[PDB]
Design a binder for these strands. Structure first.
Ligand SMILES: [Zn+2]
Ligand SMILES: [Zn+2]
Ligand SMILES: [Zn+2]
Ligand SMILES: [Zn+2]
Ligand SMILES: [Zn+2]
Ligand SMILES: [Zn+2]
Ligand SMILES: [Zn+2]
Lengths: 57, 84, 56
DNA sequence: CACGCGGCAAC
DNA sequence: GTTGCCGCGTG
DNA sequence: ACGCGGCAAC
DNA sequence: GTTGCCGCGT
């Protein structure tokens, strides 16, 4: 297992993709709001890439 | 106001982080005095020194041979070598 | 240069010493537990200096 | 060899 | 605290 | 009262 | 990388 289907990061181990998908691309029931705008997310990776894009752009 | 971009910010706090992440090619980094490691923040250098180059009162043997080390960094590089 | 009546901190200005006395050496009716053991403190300074000694 | 744990280390 | 990396323990 | 500057634990 | 920290200059 090398490439991730939901994002761009590359991983070497097979198990390390399991923890990646389960931590970054798992679906969360209760949404989390962006700390700056009014957006709300259910995926950890989508929140991180968005929330970084505010004060980093 | 981020002399590099000339992009403006309301506070100086988030301006420093814009420079650290986007303009990392212009921040004076810190060379460790014991190894080839270069570190961006000085606080991270303090941790690196405390954890990697602190004299261990006791001694920790290599998991493979009968050699003892009193520093973490030297022990890790020694165990990495056992693959060559 | 003025010396705090409760610790070895030295402060230059009287106004800054007041803030130091308020924030550091004040009493807290509900105690705060140590981040690493079951110790409980009613003063911020005691908690801080204790918690830092867990690096020993 | 697959899988999951837990430590690692600069960010 | 993050996250991928890796050494190593179960099968 | 306000805001930075170096620092530190997570 | 985040965020709180505090003595200190403004
Ligand atoms: Zn992914
Ligand atoms: Zn947002
Ligand atoms: Zn810029
Ligand atoms: Zn070093
Ligand atoms: Zn050895
Ligand atoms: Zn005091
Ligand atoms: Zn304690």
């Amino acid at each position: 297992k090398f490439h991730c289907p939901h994002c761009d990061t590359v991983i070497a181990r097979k198990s390390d993709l399991g923890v990646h998908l389960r931590k970054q691309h798992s679906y969360i029931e209760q949404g989390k709001k962006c700390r700056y705008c009014d957006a709300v997310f259910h995926e950890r990776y989508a929140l991180i890439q968005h929330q970084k894009s505010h004060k980093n752009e | 106001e981020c002399y590099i971009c000339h992009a403006r910010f309301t506070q100086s706090g988030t301006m420093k982080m814009h420079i650290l992440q986007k303009h990392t090619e212009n921040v004076a980094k810190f060379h460790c005095p014991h190894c080839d490691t270069v570190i961006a923040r000085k606080s991270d250098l303090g941790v690196h020194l405390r954890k990697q180059h602190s004299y261990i009162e006791q001694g920790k043997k290599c998991r493979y041979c009968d050699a003892v080390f009193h520093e973490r960094y030297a022990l890790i590089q020694h165990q990495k070598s056992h693959k060559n």
